[PDB]
Amino acid sequence: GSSGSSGIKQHCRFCKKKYSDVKNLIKHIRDAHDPQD
């Protein structure tokens, strides 16, 4: 009705992908991109 229904939005700008669970996003990057390294 009238209430900001929480909803996180994480997108791998790098590959313009989408991951429901952020935890996966991080693992996906360090696995594919791995820029930090």
Contact set with Zn ion (CB under 5 A): 12, 14-15
**Minimum distance from residue 27 beta carbon to Zn ion (Å):** 11
28 labeled binding residue: yes
Q: Which amino acid would we find at residue 20? A: S
33 labeled binding residue: yes
**Minimum distance from residue 1 beta carbon to Zn ion (Å):** 36
Distance, in Å, from the CA atom of 13 to the CA atom of 1, rounded to the nearest integer, reads 32
Helices (H), the chain: 22-31
For the beta carbon of residue 12, count every other beta carbon within 10 angstroms: 16
15 labeled binding residue: yes
Residue list for the binding site for Zn(2+): 12, 15, 28, 33
